[PDB]
Amino acid sequence: SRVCQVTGKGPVTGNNISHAHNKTRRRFLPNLQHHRFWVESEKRFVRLRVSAKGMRIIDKRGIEAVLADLRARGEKF
Amino acid sequence: EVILLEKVANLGNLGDKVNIKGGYARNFLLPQGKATVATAENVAAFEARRAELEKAAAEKKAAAEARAAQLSELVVTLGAHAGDEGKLFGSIGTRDIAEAVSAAGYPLEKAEVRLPNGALRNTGEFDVAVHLHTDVETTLKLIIVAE
RNA sequence: CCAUAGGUGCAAGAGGCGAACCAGGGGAACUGAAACAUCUAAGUACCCUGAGGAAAAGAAAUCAACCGAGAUUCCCUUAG
RNA sequence: AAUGGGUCAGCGACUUAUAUUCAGUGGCAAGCUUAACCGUAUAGGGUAGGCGUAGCGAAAGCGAGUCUUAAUAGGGCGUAGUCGCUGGGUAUAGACCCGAAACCGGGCGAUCUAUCCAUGAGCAGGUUGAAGGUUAGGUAACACUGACUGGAGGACCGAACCCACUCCCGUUGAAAAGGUAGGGGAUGACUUGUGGAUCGGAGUGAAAGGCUAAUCAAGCUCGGAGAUAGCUGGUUCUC
RNA sequence: AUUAAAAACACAGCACUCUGCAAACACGAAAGUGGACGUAUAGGGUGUGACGCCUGCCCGGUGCCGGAAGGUUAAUUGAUG
RNA sequence: AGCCUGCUUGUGUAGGAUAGGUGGGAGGCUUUGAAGCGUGGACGCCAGUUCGCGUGGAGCCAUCCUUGAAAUACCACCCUGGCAUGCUUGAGGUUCUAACUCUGGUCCGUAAUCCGGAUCGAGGACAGUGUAUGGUGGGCAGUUUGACUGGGGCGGUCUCC
RNA sequence: CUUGACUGCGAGACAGACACGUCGAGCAGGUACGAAAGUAGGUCUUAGUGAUCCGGUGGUUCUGUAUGGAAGGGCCAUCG
């Protein structure tokens, strides 16, 4: 499903209000793209689909602080 | 943002800190080893290797001086077709030209090239754009003779 | 080339069912408005996922006025 | 000569709860009364809260008065109750009972029928006779003629077989769609056996709004749901 | 299927138009499958309906195609008062 | 397009010229203003101006010498034509590979070519996908479309004197 | 000659389901005519028009969510 492998964002719902307030449903989908990330310790690319808000957090900690607690909640990368 | 480690780019320095786009540092400089993000944790170790940084800046240009005497020799004799006719009939090459500039030139060979000027026209010395840099390139001279 | 994927051997756990209760995910229409599009009906019916013998919630970046009250949960009033 | 009723015997229609107003009869009375909850529990405690004893004004405010106003003038308004009990009303819930066509939400169904898919077999007999080929002529040659063969076809007659054009009988039928006589196709755009695929604002359709289990201008079943009905029918002992 | 077998629907034939391949198009929240293990002498859609002789004028309305000069015109910026 | 800097540019009545100017400066002594003829430059609300002075280290506009609405020669502030180059930034154009893409080829997992991973080949900052916004949209849905009426449909009429 | 096409009112009645309606002596403010009694709260009378909610503009301490102010209300006047 459309979730992230760093931040835990899922699709939410809401409305689609018009100019006479005719409510109807839509979905809010998170931006998320495939991307490859180089590590140095295992010296190999790892590919994981992350949001654009996941790209900013990887720019904060760097790769391995976010890779380790992904393993420390028990996931495949 | 990042701390520069190379001197042969068009904005690089010895130890100057530059502010660049996020996609230019994420994708290109860091996964090769030409830069490092500025930190306040290992800064006692970067100051200890400043002597090792300037000895590395006195060796990369030293190997290039023993390298330019083998590239511009132009002794490569490519065996293409169309001996004495006039019409383009020779095997030009897009994958076999990387092995020809590596058996007697530089050994690196990887051609992900954006080009509408690839194959060459009627028999004569023309130019083929080959992998020479990482954000520019110019075309290398190719000698086309009979077979 | 190293060494990860991958493959076997063992240990421990889970899977299914059950009337209501609880917290989340998704969520109508008839009908009211003596018509009907905002609104009601209603976050109700139903459909999934969890867990417990209960759950959830809880120990102040809360409320009060210059007086003060000190966690949450539940019933009665403020008050239709 | 408008409706309903074959007769009998059983059952079959103004209810409840919470708020509030008016009357009847009661308790205490410028005061009357407690709700939760405690309780040796129908007792007792519990007066928080409510209604009253004073109004006028949109409000601050002022008060047997106050508002408007330049007003002190005029004028508007103003100078024995409370908690039970039993009745008549009213509000909100299915609200006196029975009765729709429809709409929405999870499922069941292509053993009939509509197209498609894989593997099977079925079509008595009797006619017609294309292209082609052979050979004889023929021609510079190819044309072109004859003879012998030959066996094409959404070809022709006609039974199993599939279908449904006419008449009569039947209509409480033998049959919730037949029968007896006659009809059309019958080697193919054929008929059919077994097994599978497509589903409800959705399929299939040589297209008629046709078929999807005797139901189809959007099935069947269980929930929302005792849907809504200014509309019909009924509403039970005496004076 | 069970009151309508037709002059209705089909049809071979004809024209118009879209589609250069990861095709137009359809079914699918999406992955993907048909098209098609095909490649413009192909594949979708719309009308007319073997054959013979033929198919006249109107580009104002509405639609599609072509063109940008100029006018108006969306969030986004935020001068100034 | 903002920015900078030094800014050197400033030609109408008319002054010898020339006015963006406000304060110092009465002249100005760095070859004095070397002059002066004429030297090029670019120059021009043009012969108007700046800089070389050919010579040669040679007096000049005159500091009201004038006149002109403000007088020079000199030091200060800024601005302009723009000069350059920078600093940033938009919009367009070309090219490059490293992101993303491949319903391409051959190895590996594998006895499978679905799916990965490795490497070459193509495209390449486009395509595509989130989120905000314009347009088209009976493809689809919820709904509306009055009464009186010598039957209702058509017509006539709905308020006031 | 002028602005009584005035401001605060209004005992009483007529009509009338209600909401709206019509006439009005007189009192107090400040005025225009006339020498002065006096007359003037539009036109000989009866048709010339549309509630509420919205929003817009002038006056307004009456409120102004701790306090001091403001925003936003309220009342009066007037516009679609």
Entry resolution (Å): 3.3
Q: Which nucleotide is nearest to A10 (CA to C1')?
A: C25
| Matching residue, tokens 């200890």 | B48
- The C-alpha of B28 sits at a distance from chain A's nearest C-alpha, in angstroms, of 11
| Whole-angstrom distance, CA of residue B103 vs CA of residue A73 | 51
Would you say the C-alpha torsion B17, B22, B24, B27 has a positive or negative sign?
positive
Written as one string, the DSSP assignment of B44-58 is HHHTTTHHHHHHHTT
Q: Which nucleotide is nearest to A21 (CA to C1')?
A: C38
Output phi, psi for B11, to 5 deg: -140, 5
Set out the domains of chain A in order of their start, with CATH numbers.
Answer: 1-77 (2.30.170.40)
- The C-alpha of B46 sits at a distance from chain A's nearest C-alpha, in angstroms, of 18
Report whether B81 contacts B120 (CB < 8 A).
no
Q: Check residue B110 and report its DSSP letter.
A: -
Inter-residue long-range contacts of A68-76, CB under 8 Å, 24+ positions, other chains counted: A70/A5, A70/A6, A75/A5
Q: How was this structure determined?
A: cryo-EM
Look at residues B105, B116, B23 and name the one whose alpha carbon lies nearest to residue B71: B105
Q: Is the CB of B118 under 7 A from strand F?
A: yes
